[model samples]
Target: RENQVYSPVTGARLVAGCICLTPDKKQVLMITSSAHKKRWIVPKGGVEKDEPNYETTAQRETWEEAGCIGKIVANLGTVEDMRPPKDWNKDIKQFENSRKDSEVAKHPPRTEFHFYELEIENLLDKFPECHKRHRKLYSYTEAKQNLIDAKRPELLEALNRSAIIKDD
Candidate 1:
């Protein structure tokens, strides 16, 4: 599949994801992180090389990971996912303008997640990844703690981008 591609401009990998919220925006939906099982994250995945638009890619990821469908309420904007560098495919050569890292201090890898605020129209009983993944709903504060429990800060940043959520 031609699903993954480095951003033409930023040199970071391109990803699309959703901040799936209930119609009333009281609860947000998240799924078990495949890499970190105890932690939960919003439905997210990489954009396909030939995908027509980011909205479609974000919606597809949500449907696959959360078993839901909805209209994109707004663009929540992008967040840079920072994680240990060993995990993602990285090479100075791949990032044409990037400097060689072999002789430099190791740095966190970057993946740009373009997120949208989606108003879930339906939460399906049976949908893709149902058997393999778990989904949960959390109030704003609960979601914050869950992320910090086994927190991935990049996700926290993404969650904060939601217009429905504001720092207290």
Candidate 2:
């Protein structure tokens, strides 16, 4: 994967990331937030206020959002989805922006998220937490299909483009 290094307009350095998988190494683990926040995004979060390495933050965020406590299978490279200094880009057709003004006004930090794959079984055993959090898991196959149904050509391209072949 490629390195993730960027500077926000605020010139602060930070990172955001997610830990997801293909369940059986064949699909992605997509999720939808509660009924209120029904946008489809991978389980992700930002680096801690005091943390240094954002990769570690990726592991921690996965636990908080997906209850996926395990090892990092592979790094899927970082994505630069920085929003414009203002919300004007909200209508632009690109990465979905979910950050709020309050969140941004709070000096939202720039991020260098490291993607990782985690192996697990009995996904439902990890469901109680999702149920409480109002999050639901969707199979990778379905997620990919969702992107296709939405006509997100770039998404499909990125998915196929970012895949890396590990030397075994």
Candidate 3:
């Protein structure tokens, strides 16, 4: 083991998340990442120990992160992050100078995000991570136009596949 170093960053990171929408299906809830405050993302978290399933995890993440309770309307599909996107550099740049090693430079545990369509029922003004995160609502069109991340295609495709939008 010439260059071997013991690092806790190993294996694929499994995450459960949801595209939580308002009851009327007019808007979806998005959260600002604690690491990258400017980038908007869905409510999500790492899988907990002995978690029953991704669906249940998604429900729990939605509740805990966004302080919202909801039912799974559909499986919106998954997003896999093999490498950080181009614009992702901005995220790292934000806090790169503050730290010595800059943890962001390390190889990220390949993250597989399992996403579901959650029809939101209620919203709590105060949530566990409220102080560290920002939550907001956006219309389908707005999300489609504004989620300018590299995963935007996969994210929007998931929305299109959901029953949230119907031909009326």
Candidate 4:
């Protein structure tokens, strides 16, 4: 499919990403957060203003965040992050503002992480976010454990759906 239906659940914005695996399909690639959140995760980012579709956004984010060129082997499906029902206040305008005033509340903004399973095409020498991110290749088991330890159920679920790593 070129793209999926984009009638996203209300309140949250669209996001797309990739779970990258080696050409041999023996290992997976993950990266550190741009803010250096210390936890490791796969390439993920929100849709850009001019981005065309989910696949494009997915591939672009994979290259930008992970710095590893790759082709999508399969769509890993969606992971929705449900927010606290009481957090009822939408950002007045997140697009114009660079950052919200020191972590404010939002009307339980929803988020759906769309993930694709990508096979490494080639790793670039440098990419847009290369300086801010760090990439690493991990065994299937290791990658699984890392995401779980990072408390990233969204990422973990995305990785879990990948064709490369299924069952022990």
Winning candidate number (lDDT): 1
Cα lDDT of model 4 overall? 0.76
**TM-score-better candidate, 2 vs 4:** 4
Query: How far does residue 152 in candidate 4 sit from its true spot (Å)?
Result: 0.8
Per-residue lDDT of 1-168 in model 3, one digit per residue for the tens? 222122245555677788888777878888877787777777877777667778978887887778888889888777765565455756635333334555345455366778898888889998888788888888877677656672555566666666655332
Q: What C-alpha lDDT, on a 0 to 100 scale, does residue 81 get in candidate 4? A: 61
List the candidates ranked by lDDT, beginning with the highest. Answer: 1, 4, 3, 2
Task: List residue ranges in candidate 2 displaced over 4 A.
Answer: 1-13, 34-36, 85-112, 121-132, 135-141, 145-168
Cα lDDT tens digits for candidate 2, 1-168: 224344546454445545454444555554455443544555556565566775677766666666665556666665544434555447444344456622332334344345555554434446434664544444445666655664433333334433322221
**Each prediction's TM-score versus the true structure:** 0.80, 0.56, 0.70, 0.76
TM-score winner among the candidates? 1
Q: What TM-score does model 2 achieve against the real structure?
A: 0.56
Worst 10 residues of 3 by lDDT: 1-10
TM-score of 1: 0.80
lDDT of each: 0.80, 0.51, 0.72, 0.76
User: Can you give the lDDT of residue 146 in candidate 4?
Assistant: 84
For every candidate, C-alpha RMSD to the true structure in Å:
5.8, 9.7, 9.6, 9.1
Tens digits of per-residue lDDT for model 4 on 1-168?
323333355646678989898877778898987665688888877876577778898988888887788778797888976544542446444322335445433344457788888989899878998778788899888888888777777777788788774544
Candidate 2 or 3, higher TM-score?
Answer: 3
